Coordinates of C-alpha atoms in Angstrom, one line a residue:
Chain A
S1 CA -33.2 48.9 10.1
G2 CA -32.4 51.6 7.5
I3 CA -33.7 52.5 4.1
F4 CA -34.0 49.0 2.6
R5 CA -36.3 49.5 -0.3
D6 CA -36.1 51.6 -3.4
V7 CA -36.2 55.3 -3.4
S8 CA -37.9 57.1 -6.4
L9 CA -39.1 60.4 -7.8
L10 CA -42.4 60.4 -9.9
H11 CA -43.5 63.3 -12.0
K12 CA -47.3 63.6 -12.5
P13 CA -49.5 66.0 -14.4
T14 CA -51.8 68.2 -12.3
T15 CA -54.8 66.6 -13.6
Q16 CA -54.2 62.9 -13.2
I17 CA -55.1 59.4 -12.6
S18 CA -55.0 58.8 -9.0
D19 CA -56.3 55.3 -8.7
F20 CA -57.9 52.4 -10.5
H21 CA -59.3 49.0 -9.7
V22 CA -59.8 46.1 -11.9
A23 CA -62.4 43.3 -11.9
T24 CA -63.6 40.3 -13.7
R25 CA -66.8 38.5 -13.9
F26 CA -67.7 35.3 -15.8
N27 CA -70.8 33.3 -16.7
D28 CA -71.5 29.7 -15.5
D29 CA -68.6 28.4 -17.5
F30 CA -66.0 31.0 -18.1
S31 CA -66.9 31.3 -21.8
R32 CA -67.5 35.1 -21.3
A33 CA -66.0 37.5 -19.0
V34 CA -66.6 41.2 -18.2
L35 CA -63.7 43.2 -17.1
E36 CA -64.8 46.2 -15.0
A37 CA -62.4 49.1 -14.5
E38 CA -63.1 52.0 -12.2
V39 CA -60.8 55.0 -12.6
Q40 CA -60.4 58.1 -10.3
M41 CA -59.0 61.5 -10.9
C42 CA -57.4 64.4 -9.2
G43 CA -57.1 68.0 -10.3
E44 CA -59.2 70.3 -12.4
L45 CA -62.4 68.5 -13.6
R46 CA -63.4 69.5 -17.2
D47 CA -66.1 68.4 -19.6
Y48 CA -63.4 67.7 -22.2
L49 CA -61.6 65.0 -20.1
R50 CA -62.2 61.3 -21.0
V51 CA -60.8 58.0 -20.0
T52 CA -59.9 55.3 -22.4
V53 CA -59.4 51.7 -21.4
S54 CA -57.9 49.1 -23.7
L55 CA -57.2 45.5 -23.1
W56 CA -54.4 43.9 -25.0
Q57 CA -53.4 40.3 -25.8
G58 CA -49.9 40.9 -26.7
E59 CA -49.9 42.8 -29.9
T60 CA -53.5 42.3 -30.2
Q61 CA -56.2 44.7 -28.9
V62 CA -59.2 42.8 -27.5
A63 CA -61.5 45.4 -26.1
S64 CA -61.6 49.2 -25.7
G65 CA -63.9 51.6 -23.9
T66 CA -64.0 55.4 -23.6
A67 CA -66.1 57.5 -21.5
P68 CA -66.3 60.7 -19.7
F69 CA -66.0 61.2 -16.0
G70 CA -68.9 61.0 -13.6
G71 CA -70.7 57.8 -12.5
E72 CA -73.9 56.3 -11.2
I73 CA -76.0 57.9 -8.5
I74 CA -75.1 56.1 -5.3
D75 CA -76.9 58.1 -2.7
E76 CA -79.2 61.0 -2.1
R77 CA -76.4 63.4 -2.9
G78 CA -75.5 62.0 -6.2
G79 CA -72.4 60.2 -7.4
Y80 CA -68.8 60.7 -8.2
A81 CA -67.9 63.4 -10.7
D82 CA -64.3 62.4 -10.6
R83 CA -64.7 58.7 -11.3
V84 CA -65.9 56.4 -14.0
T85 CA -66.4 52.8 -14.6
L86 CA -65.9 51.1 -17.9
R87 CA -67.1 47.7 -18.8
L88 CA -65.5 45.6 -21.4
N89 CA -66.9 42.4 -22.7
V90 CA -64.4 39.6 -23.4
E91 CA -65.4 36.4 -25.2
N92 CA -63.6 33.2 -24.3
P93 CA -61.0 34.7 -22.1
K94 CA -57.8 32.8 -21.4
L95 CA -57.8 32.1 -17.6
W96 CA -54.9 32.7 -15.4
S97 CA -53.7 30.0 -13.0
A98 CA -50.5 28.9 -11.6
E99 CA -50.4 26.1 -14.1
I100 CA -51.0 28.6 -16.9
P101 CA -50.4 32.1 -15.9
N102 CA -52.1 33.7 -19.0
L103 CA -52.0 37.4 -18.7
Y104 CA -53.5 40.4 -20.4
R105 CA -52.3 44.0 -20.5
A106 CA -54.6 46.9 -19.7
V107 CA -53.8 50.5 -20.6
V108 CA -55.6 53.3 -18.8
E109 CA -55.4 56.6 -20.7
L110 CA -56.4 60.0 -19.5
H111 CA -56.8 62.5 -22.3
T112 CA -58.8 65.2 -23.8
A113 CA -61.9 65.0 -25.9
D114 CA -59.9 65.8 -29.0
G115 CA -57.9 62.7 -28.1
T116 CA -54.9 64.5 -26.6
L117 CA -53.2 62.2 -24.0
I118 CA -52.5 63.6 -20.6
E119 CA -51.2 60.5 -19.0
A120 CA -51.0 56.7 -19.0
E121 CA -51.1 53.9 -16.4
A122 CA -51.3 50.2 -16.9
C123 CA -51.3 46.7 -15.6
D124 CA -51.1 43.0 -16.4
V125 CA -54.4 41.5 -15.8
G126 CA -55.3 37.9 -15.4
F127 CA -58.8 36.5 -15.5
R128 CA -59.7 34.3 -12.5
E129 CA -62.4 33.6 -10.0
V130 CA -61.4 32.8 -6.5
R131 CA -64.4 31.7 -4.4
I132 CA -65.4 29.5 -1.5
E133 CA -68.4 27.4 -2.3
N134 CA -69.8 24.6 -0.2
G135 CA -66.9 24.4 2.0
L136 CA -64.3 24.3 -0.8
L137 CA -61.8 26.9 -1.9
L138 CA -62.4 27.0 -5.7
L139 CA -60.3 28.5 -8.5
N140 CA -61.8 29.1 -11.8
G141 CA -64.3 26.5 -10.8
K142 CA -62.0 23.8 -9.4
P143 CA -61.0 23.0 -5.9
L144 CA -57.4 23.9 -5.3
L145 CA -54.8 21.8 -3.6
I146 CA -52.4 24.2 -2.1
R147 CA -48.7 23.2 -2.4
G148 CA -47.1 26.2 -0.7
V149 CA -44.4 27.6 1.4
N150 CA -43.9 30.6 3.7
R151 CA -41.1 32.9 2.7
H152 CA -39.4 35.9 4.1
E153 CA -37.3 38.4 2.3
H154 CA -33.8 37.3 3.4
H155 CA -30.4 37.6 1.9
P156 CA -27.1 36.4 3.5
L157 CA -25.1 39.3 2.5
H158 CA -27.8 42.0 1.8
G159 CA -29.9 41.5 4.8
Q160 CA -33.5 42.5 4.1
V161 CA -32.8 43.9 0.7
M162 CA -34.4 42.2 -2.2
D163 CA -33.4 42.1 -5.9
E164 CA -34.8 40.5 -9.0
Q165 CA -32.1 37.9 -9.2
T166 CA -32.9 36.6 -5.8
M167 CA -36.6 36.9 -6.3
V168 CA -36.4 34.9 -9.6
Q169 CA -34.0 32.2 -8.1
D170 CA -36.5 31.6 -5.3
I171 CA -39.3 31.4 -8.0
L172 CA -37.6 28.9 -10.2
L173 CA -36.7 26.8 -7.3
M174 CA -40.2 26.6 -5.8
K175 CA -41.6 25.7 -9.2
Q176 CA -39.0 23.1 -9.9
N177 CA -39.8 21.6 -6.5
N178 CA -43.6 21.5 -7.2
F179 CA -44.7 24.4 -5.0
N180 CA -48.0 26.1 -6.1
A181 CA -48.3 29.0 -3.7
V182 CA -46.4 31.2 -1.4
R183 CA -47.3 33.1 1.8
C184 CA -45.8 36.6 2.5
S185 CA -44.7 35.9 6.1
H186 CA -45.5 38.2 7.6
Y187 CA -45.7 41.5 5.8
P188 CA -46.3 43.0 2.4
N189 CA -43.5 42.4 0.0
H190 CA -41.3 44.2 -2.5
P191 CA -43.5 45.5 -5.1
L192 CA -41.9 43.4 -7.8
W193 CA -42.5 40.2 -6.1
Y194 CA -46.2 40.3 -7.1
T195 CA -45.4 41.0 -10.8
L196 CA -43.0 38.0 -10.8
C197 CA -45.7 35.7 -9.3
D198 CA -48.2 37.0 -11.8
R199 CA -46.0 36.0 -14.8
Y200 CA -44.3 32.8 -13.5
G201 CA -47.5 31.6 -12.0
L202 CA -47.7 31.2 -8.3
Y203 CA -50.5 31.7 -5.7
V204 CA -49.8 34.5 -3.3
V205 CA -51.1 35.3 0.2
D206 CA -50.7 39.0 0.9
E207 CA -50.1 39.6 4.6
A208 CA -50.3 42.7 6.6
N209 CA -47.5 44.1 8.5
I210 CA -48.9 43.2 12.0
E211 CA -47.4 40.8 14.6
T212 CA -47.5 41.4 18.3
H213 CA -46.3 38.1 19.5
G214 CA -44.4 39.2 22.5
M215 CA -47.5 40.8 24.1
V216 CA -49.2 39.1 27.0
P217 CA -51.8 38.0 26.3
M218 CA -51.3 38.1 22.7
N219 CA -54.6 40.2 22.4
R220 CA -53.4 43.3 24.3
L221 CA -52.9 45.7 21.4
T222 CA -55.4 44.2 18.8
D223 CA -58.3 44.2 21.2
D224 CA -57.5 47.9 22.0
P225 CA -59.4 50.6 20.1
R226 CA -56.6 53.0 20.6
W227 CA -54.6 50.8 18.3
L228 CA -57.3 50.4 15.6
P229 CA -56.2 53.4 13.8
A230 CA -52.5 52.1 13.6
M231 CA -53.5 48.6 12.6
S232 CA -56.1 49.8 10.0
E233 CA -53.4 51.6 8.1
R234 CA -51.5 48.3 7.7
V235 CA -54.5 46.5 6.3
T236 CA -56.1 49.2 4.1
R237 CA -52.9 50.6 2.4
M238 CA -52.0 47.1 1.7
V239 CA -55.2 46.3 -0.1
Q240 CA -55.0 49.7 -1.9
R241 CA -51.7 48.9 -3.3
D242 CA -51.8 45.2 -4.4
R243 CA -55.4 44.6 -5.1
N244 CA -55.1 44.5 -8.9
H245 CA -52.7 41.5 -9.0
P246 CA -54.1 38.4 -10.4
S247 CA -51.8 36.3 -8.2
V248 CA -53.0 37.6 -4.9
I249 CA -55.9 35.2 -4.1
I250 CA -56.1 35.6 -0.4
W251 CA -55.7 38.5 2.1
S252 CA -54.3 37.9 5.5
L253 CA -54.7 40.1 8.6
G254 CA -51.1 39.6 9.6
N255 CA -49.7 37.1 12.2
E256 CA -49.7 36.0 15.8
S257 CA -51.5 38.9 17.3
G258 CA -54.0 36.8 19.1
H259 CA -57.7 37.7 18.5
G260 CA -59.0 41.2 19.0
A261 CA -61.9 43.4 17.9
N262 CA -59.8 45.3 15.6
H263 CA -59.4 42.0 13.9
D264 CA -63.1 41.8 13.3
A265 CA -63.4 45.4 12.1
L266 CA -60.6 44.7 9.7
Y267 CA -62.0 41.5 8.3
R268 CA -65.2 43.4 7.5
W269 CA -63.4 46.2 5.8
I270 CA -61.8 43.9 3.3
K271 CA -64.9 41.8 2.8
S272 CA -66.6 45.1 1.8
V273 CA -64.0 46.8 -0.4
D274 CA -63.0 43.5 -2.2
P275 CA -65.5 40.8 -2.1
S276 CA -63.3 39.1 -4.6
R277 CA -60.8 37.2 -2.4
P278 CA -61.2 35.3 0.9
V279 CA -59.8 36.5 4.1
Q280 CA -57.7 34.6 6.6
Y281 CA -56.3 35.2 10.0
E282 CA -54.9 32.5 12.3
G283 CA -54.6 34.2 15.6
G284 CA -56.8 33.3 18.5
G285 CA -57.5 29.7 17.5
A286 CA -57.5 29.7 13.8
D287 CA -61.2 29.3 13.4
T288 CA -62.4 32.7 14.5
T289 CA -65.0 35.1 13.0
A290 CA -62.1 36.9 11.5
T291 CA -61.2 34.2 9.0
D292 CA -62.8 32.6 6.0
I293 CA -60.5 29.6 6.3
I294 CA -59.5 27.3 9.1
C295 CA -55.8 28.1 9.0
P296 CA -53.9 26.5 11.9
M297 CA -50.2 26.4 12.3
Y298 CA -48.5 23.1 13.3
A299 CA -51.6 21.1 13.9
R300 CA -51.0 17.4 13.6
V301 CA -52.4 14.9 11.3
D302 CA -54.2 12.7 13.8
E303 CA -53.2 13.8 17.2
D304 CA -54.9 16.5 19.1
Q305 CA -53.0 19.1 21.1
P306 CA -55.5 20.5 23.5
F307 CA -54.1 23.7 24.7
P308 CA -56.5 25.6 26.9
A309 CA -58.2 28.3 24.8
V310 CA -56.4 27.6 21.7
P311 CA -56.3 23.9 21.0
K312 CA -54.9 22.5 17.8
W313 CA -57.2 19.7 16.9
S314 CA -56.1 16.9 14.7
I315 CA -56.7 18.4 11.1
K316 CA -59.0 15.5 10.3
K317 CA -61.0 16.2 13.5
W318 CA -61.3 20.0 13.0
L319 CA -63.2 19.7 9.8
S320 CA -66.1 17.9 11.5
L321 CA -66.4 19.8 14.6
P322 CA -70.1 20.5 15.2
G323 CA -71.2 23.3 13.0
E324 CA -67.7 23.6 11.1
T325 CA -68.2 24.1 7.4
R326 CA -64.9 25.9 6.3
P327 CA -62.1 24.6 4.3
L328 CA -58.8 23.9 6.1
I329 CA -55.5 25.2 4.9
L330 CA -52.5 25.1 7.2
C331 CA -50.7 28.5 7.3
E332 CA -47.6 26.8 8.8
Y333 CA -46.7 23.1 9.0
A334 CA -43.8 20.7 8.6
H335 CA -41.3 22.9 10.5
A336 CA -38.1 22.4 8.4
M337 CA -35.6 23.2 11.1
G338 CA -32.4 21.4 10.3
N339 CA -32.7 17.7 9.9
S340 CA -36.5 17.7 9.6
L341 CA -39.6 17.2 7.5
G342 CA -40.3 13.8 9.0
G343 CA -43.8 12.8 8.7
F344 CA -44.5 14.8 5.6
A345 CA -46.0 12.0 3.7
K346 CA -48.5 11.8 6.4
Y347 CA -50.0 15.2 5.6
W348 CA -50.0 14.7 1.8
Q349 CA -51.8 11.6 2.3
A350 CA -54.5 13.3 4.3
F351 CA -54.5 16.3 1.9
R352 CA -55.3 13.9 -1.0
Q353 CA -57.9 11.9 0.9
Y354 CA -60.1 14.7 2.6
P355 CA -61.8 17.1 0.2
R356 CA -61.7 19.9 2.7
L357 CA -58.0 19.5 3.5
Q358 CA -56.6 21.6 0.7
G359 CA -53.0 22.1 1.5
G360 CA -50.8 24.2 3.6
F361 CA -47.7 26.2 3.6
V362 CA -44.4 24.7 4.7
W363 CA -42.5 26.7 7.2
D364 CA -40.2 27.9 5.7
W365 CA -38.3 28.7 2.5
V366 CA -34.7 29.8 3.5
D367 CA -32.4 30.0 6.5
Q368 CA -32.0 33.3 8.0
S369 CA -28.5 33.0 8.5
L370 CA -26.0 35.7 8.0
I371 CA -22.4 35.8 6.8
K372 CA -19.4 36.5 8.9
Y373 CA -15.6 36.4 8.7
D374 CA -12.4 36.3 10.8
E375 CA -8.8 36.2 9.6
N376 CA -8.8 35.8 5.9
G377 CA -12.2 37.5 5.6
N378 CA -13.4 34.0 5.1
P379 CA -17.1 33.8 5.3
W380 CA -19.2 31.8 7.7
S381 CA -23.0 31.4 8.4
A382 CA -24.0 33.2 11.6
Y383 CA -27.0 32.8 13.8
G384 CA -28.8 34.0 16.9
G385 CA -26.3 35.3 19.3
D386 CA -23.5 35.5 16.8
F387 CA -23.3 39.2 16.9
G388 CA -23.3 39.9 20.6
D389 CA -27.1 40.2 20.3
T390 CA -29.0 39.6 23.5
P391 CA -31.4 38.3 23.8
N392 CA -31.6 35.8 21.0
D393 CA -33.0 32.5 19.9
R394 CA -29.9 31.0 18.6
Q395 CA -30.5 28.7 15.7
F396 CA -34.2 29.2 15.7
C397 CA -33.8 31.5 12.8
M398 CA -32.8 28.5 10.7
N399 CA -35.8 26.5 9.3
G400 CA -35.8 26.7 5.6
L401 CA -35.9 24.0 2.9
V402 CA -32.8 25.7 1.4
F403 CA -29.7 27.2 2.8
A404 CA -29.5 31.1 2.8
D405 CA -27.6 30.7 -0.4
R406 CA -30.4 28.8 -2.1
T407 CA -28.7 25.4 -1.9
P408 CA -30.9 22.7 -0.9
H409 CA -31.3 20.9 2.3
Chain B
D1 CA -87.5 0.1 16.3
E2 CA -87.6 -1.0 12.7
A3 CA -90.2 -1.6 10.1
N4 CA -90.5 -5.0 8.7
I5 CA -89.3 -4.1 5.2
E6 CA -86.4 -5.8 3.5
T7 CA -86.0 -6.3 -0.2
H8 CA -82.4 -7.1 -0.5
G9 CA -82.8 -9.7 -3.2
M10 CA -84.2 -7.4 -5.8
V11 CA -82.4 -5.8 -8.8
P12 CA -81.9 -3.1 -8.2
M13 CA -82.6 -3.1 -4.5
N14 CA -84.8 -0.1 -5.1
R15 CA -87.1 -1.9 -7.5
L16 CA -90.2 -2.2 -5.3
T17 CA -89.6 0.8 -3.2
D18 CA -89.4 3.3 -6.0
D19 CA -92.8 1.9 -7.1
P20 CA -95.9 3.8 -6.2
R21 CA -97.8 0.5 -6.5
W22 CA -96.0 -0.9 -3.3
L23 CA -96.5 2.4 -1.3
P24 CA -99.6 1.3 0.4
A25 CA -98.1 -2.0 1.4
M26 CA -95.0 -0.5 2.8
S27 CA -97.1 2.2 4.4
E28 CA -98.8 -0.3 6.6
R29 CA -95.4 -1.6 7.8
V30 CA -94.4 1.8 9.1
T31 CA -97.6 3.1 10.3
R32 CA -98.8 0.2 12.3
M33 CA -95.4 0.0 13.8
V34 CA -95.4 3.6 15.0
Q35 CA -99.0 3.2 16.1
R36 CA -98.1 0.3 18.3
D37 CA -94.9 1.3 20.0
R38 CA -95.1 5.0 20.3
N39 CA -95.4 5.1 24.0
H40 CA -92.1 3.3 24.8
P41 CA -89.6 5.5 26.5
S42 CA -87.0 3.0 25.4
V43 CA -87.7 3.5 21.7
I44 CA -85.5 6.4 20.7
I45 CA -85.1 6.1 16.9
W46 CA -87.4 4.8 14.1
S47 CA -86.1 2.9 11.1
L48 CA -87.8 2.4 7.8
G49 CA -86.4 -1.1 7.4
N50 CA -83.4 -2.5 5.8
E51 CA -81.6 -3.2 2.5
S52 CA -84.2 -1.9 0.3
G53 CA -82.2 0.6 -1.6
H54 CA -83.7 4.1 -1.8
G55 CA -87.1 4.7 -3.2
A56 CA -89.7 7.7 -3.2
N57 CA -91.8 5.6 -1.0
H58 CA -89.0 5.8 1.6
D59 CA -89.1 9.6 1.3
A60 CA -92.8 9.7 1.9
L61 CA -92.7 7.4 4.9
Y62 CA -89.9 9.3 6.5
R63 CA -92.0 12.4 6.2
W64 CA -95.0 10.8 7.5
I65 CA -93.2 9.9 10.7
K66 CA -91.6 13.2 11.0
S67 CA -95.1 14.7 11.2
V68 CA -96.9 12.2 13.3
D69 CA -94.0 11.8 15.8
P70 CA -91.5 14.5 16.0
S71 CA -90.1 13.2 19.3
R72 CA -87.8 10.7 17.5
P73 CA -85.3 10.9 14.7
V74 CA -85.6 8.7 11.8
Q75 CA -82.9 6.7 10.2
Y76 CA -82.3 4.5 7.2
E77 CA -79.3 3.2 5.5
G78 CA -80.5 2.1 2.0
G79 CA -79.2 4.1 -1.0
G80 CA -75.9 5.0 0.5
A81 CA -76.7 5.6 4.2
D82 CA -76.7 9.5 3.9
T83 CA -80.0 10.1 1.8
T84 CA -82.8 12.5 2.4
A85 CA -84.6 9.8 4.1
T86 CA -82.5 9.6 7.2
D87 CA -81.6 11.9 10.0
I88 CA -78.4 10.2 11.1
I89 CA -75.7 9.0 8.7
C90 CA -75.9 5.2 9.4
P91 CA -73.6 3.1 7.2
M92 CA -73.2 -0.5 7.7
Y93 CA -69.5 -1.8 7.7
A94 CA -67.6 1.3 6.9
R95 CA -63.9 1.4 7.9
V96 CA -62.3 3.7 10.3
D97 CA -59.8 5.0 8.0
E98 CA -60.2 3.2 4.8
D99 CA -62.5 4.3 2.0
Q100 CA -64.5 1.6 0.2
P101 CA -65.4 3.2 -3.0
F102 CA -68.3 1.4 -4.3
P103 CA -70.0 3.0 -7.3
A104 CA -73.2 4.9 -6.4
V105 CA -72.9 3.6 -2.8
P106 CA -69.4 4.2 -1.6
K107 CA -68.6 3.6 2.1
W108 CA -66.1 6.2 3.0
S109 CA -63.9 6.0 6.0
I110 CA -66.1 7.1 8.8
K111 CA -63.9 10.0 9.9
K112 CA -63.9 11.4 6.4
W113 CA -67.7 10.9 6.0
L114 CA -68.6 13.5 8.6
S115 CA -66.4 16.1 6.7
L116 CA -67.8 15.6 3.2
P117 CA -68.8 19.1 1.8
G118 CA -72.1 20.1 3.1
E119 CA -72.5 17.2 5.6
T120 CA -73.6 18.1 9.1
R121 CA -75.4 15.0 10.5
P122 CA -74.0 12.7 13.2
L123 CA -72.8 9.2 12.3
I124 CA -73.8 6.1 14.1
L125 CA -73.0 2.7 12.4
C126 CA -76.1 0.5 12.0
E127 CA -73.9 -2.5 11.6
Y128 CA -70.3 -2.7 12.3
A129 CA -67.7 -5.3 13.3
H130 CA -69.1 -8.7 12.0
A131 CA -68.6 -11.1 14.8
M132 CA -68.6 -14.2 12.5
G133 CA -66.5 -17.0 14.1
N134 CA -63.0 -15.8 15.2
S135 CA -63.5 -12.1 14.8
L136 CA -63.7 -8.6 16.3
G137 CA -60.3 -7.8 15.0
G138 CA -60.0 -4.0 15.0
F139 CA -62.7 -3.3 17.4
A140 CA -60.5 -0.9 19.3
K141 CA -59.7 1.1 16.2
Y142 CA -63.3 2.0 16.3
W143 CA -63.8 2.7 20.0
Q144 CA -61.1 5.2 19.7
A145 CA -62.5 7.1 16.8
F146 CA -65.8 7.1 18.6
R147 CA -64.0 8.7 21.5
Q148 CA -62.1 11.3 19.6
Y149 CA -64.8 12.5 17.2
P150 CA -67.8 14.2 18.8
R151 CA -69.9 13.5 15.9
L152 CA -69.1 9.7 15.7
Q153 CA -71.5 8.5 18.3
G154 CA -71.3 4.7 18.3
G155 CA -72.8 1.9 16.4
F156 CA -74.4 -1.5 16.6
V157 CA -72.4 -4.5 16.4
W158 CA -73.6 -7.3 14.1
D159 CA -74.7 -9.3 15.9
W160 CA -76.0 -10.7 19.2
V161 CA -76.3 -14.5 18.6
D162 CA -75.6 -17.2 16.0
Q163 CA -78.6 -18.4 14.1
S164 CA -77.9 -22.0 14.7
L165 CA -80.3 -24.7 15.1
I166 CA -80.1 -28.0 17.1
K167 CA -79.9 -31.3 15.3
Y168 CA -79.4 -34.9 16.5
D169 CA -77.0 -37.7 15.8
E170 CA -78.0 -41.4 15.6
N171 CA -77.7 -41.6 19.3
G172 CA -80.0 -38.6 19.4
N173 CA -77.1 -36.5 20.4
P174 CA -77.7 -32.8 20.0
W175 CA -75.9 -30.7 17.4
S176 CA -75.8 -27.2 16.0
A177 CA -76.8 -27.0 12.4
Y178 CA -76.3 -24.3 9.8
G179 CA -76.8 -23.3 6.1
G180 CA -78.0 -26.3 4.3
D181 CA -77.9 -28.8 7.2
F182 CA -81.7 -29.3 6.5
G183 CA -81.5 -30.0 2.8
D184 CA -82.2 -26.4 2.5
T185 CA -81.2 -25.3 -0.9
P186 CA -80.0 -22.9 -1.6
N187 CA -78.2 -21.8 1.5
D188 CA -75.6 -19.5 2.9
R189 CA -73.9 -22.1 5.2
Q190 CA -72.3 -20.6 8.3
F191 CA -73.1 -17.0 7.4
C192 CA -76.0 -17.2 9.9
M193 CA -73.5 -17.4 12.6
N194 CA -72.2 -13.9 13.3
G195 CA -73.0 -13.7 17.1
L196 CA -70.9 -12.5 19.9
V197 CA -72.5 -15.5 21.6
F198 CA -73.5 -19.1 21.0
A199 CA -77.2 -19.7 20.5
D200 CA -77.1 -21.1 24.0
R201 CA -76.1 -17.7 25.1
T202 CA -72.6 -18.9 26.0
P203 CA -70.1 -16.3 25.0
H204 CA -67.5 -16.1 22.3

């Protein structure tokens, strides 16, 4: 607990840019894309306000568009006076991908008709298409194979406080070890994380700050309308903040909160406001109406585990269940607690042989161990219980592929 | 129940069956068959024949059946076992876990076959577990798959009896013949003996 993330002051002009979404469409082969930017304003509307949108390629300007406020007629009452959509044509765009995170820079300027700048906002943009077609999760046209890991924001001395250095270290490591993607277990991350994944090249899974594991049944809160309002905030503000990041390629409703109706409302919301990325949730069985992907946790390669209500079928079996058409991507597998990761080769072998098995996310990146001392203020890794904390799960907070200090297991 | 149409020896297998000229002739094979057995509660599936590859004529014939007799599914293995001319995926000799990647006509592992993108049909082997001589090794690997996968619904072992004939020594002593034992050239020797039982109906 405490004030763990940055604290800032931002000075804005009364008439300003208040929001802006980015989008990219391509033809059958990615030889031509259309960038579509929608910008919104706040303050005094005037006929002399304009919006200019330029897309750069380093020192090169690739496309520019200017327009005045006010958009299409959407309903019987009109349209938005305080909004505008520009559409830039881009020929032979350089696609973004974890293998080659090619990025563009977009500048959004608010000025006057005479050309007098009132304010500027901007963002790195990367051209990609994430889609699910015929049972496969495609990326820029090709079926991905997810090599990922779940990762919390943990630091042995700092606690929950993140910092570039840590963020980068973690990045270089996962890449050096042939990781493709990462899952934000189990909450939205530090703003800069997304920027780093955009430039280094890593597939992200943005997860909502909702987990109600300890409830019995798990459903309790998420199937209760009185809680819809509180949950909705965690999904919506999440999508409102990170939606323009090329690296985020999937949205997740949060974790282990069983399966409630709020879950369905929420899945529909995203599907509507951002048809561009798939949606996953694992609760309630991993193959619910609230998920675009079968995403089980800890389901075995060839052995079923038939829990009542929420069985974990063998991953090869799941795919072929009668009526099942979705791709399967484990949200958690190969629980790396201590001396573990036995049987790994078994998954990889299935991953490579079944078209619809497309990866998974190892659980987890680092050990959540803390530092302590004694006599000589000599440090030592602490775990559950080590603080007088009761209750506790002892060493169960230790399951990473690396020690809290980023040294390898 | 299966139409008397097999054209295995052609090149490609599909050579007569993709020919309009042969349509009428195949036609008779399927129609008279359907016409004659349609009232048998035991008949539960119709088959357009065997090892004939995949031709347009199959496609038509499948359709024909579907309209005249919608109480039975139709199956056919030619051309890869999962064509538009069959209702059930029905490979012959596919492995439980091992993919056999033949070009144009691969024989995926059966568990993986059900999951191919887009696939939704059930899988019943039309021929599996060749019981030629000292065989049936693996049988159980199968019966387990069948039991774990809802959509793997069995198969038909190949086959019931050995196609042996009875010959006689100088004393007129009886004796089981096989490929070539008649001066029959060319032959495929002992390949006619794949039964789970001796021609006498004594078990292996």
